[PDB]
Amino acid sequence: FTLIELMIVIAIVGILAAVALPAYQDYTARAQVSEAILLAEGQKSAVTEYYLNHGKWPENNTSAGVASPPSDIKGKYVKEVEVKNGVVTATMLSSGVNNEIKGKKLSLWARRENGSVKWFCGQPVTRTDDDTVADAKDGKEIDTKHLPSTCRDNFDAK
C-alpha cells in the first residue's frame, strides 16, 4: 500500500517548482514593465511634434495634446503615463503587479539632434533645461534587472 512513491513524485515536482518559481517571477515582471515601456512610447509622436513645431518641450499632457490626466493613460499593470517637460514617465500600478516593481517608474526623454529628436529609455529623469535631464532617482525607479537592454540609458546618454 504506496504513499512512498507518490511522496516522491510530489517531492521531485515541488523542488522543481521551487526552482522554477524565481525565473517566472522575473519573467512576469519583465512582461509587466514591457507594457509601461509601451504606454510611454505611444506618447513620443506628440512630444516630438510639439518640440518640432515650436522649439519648446510640451509642459504637460494637455500641451502635448494627450489625455490630460495621466490616469487616463493606463494599462493592465501601469497606473499613469505623464508628460512633464517633454519627459514621459510611466508608473506601475500597485495591484496585479509583482511586488518588486509595484508603484515604480521609468522615463523616456529626447534630445535635439538639430532637425529631429533622439529618444532614450531608462530609469526616471527630470528635465533641467531644454537639452539636459537629470536622474530623478528617489527610490521608486524600476530596477535595472527588469528593464530590457533597449531601455538602459543613463541620464547623460547620447
Ligand SMILES: *[C@@H]1O[C@H](CO)[C@@H](O)[C@H](O[C@H]2O[C@H](CO)[C@H](O)[C@H](O)[C@H]2O)[C@H]1NC(C)=O
Ligand atoms: C502647454 O505647454 C506649454 C509649453 O511651452 C505651456 O506654456 C502651456 O501653458 C501656457 O498656456 C496655458 C493655457 O491655458 C496657460 O495659459 C499657462 O499659464 C501658459 O504657460 C502648456 N499648457 C498648459 C495647459 O499648461
Ligand SMILES: [Pt+2]
Ligand atoms: Pt502651438
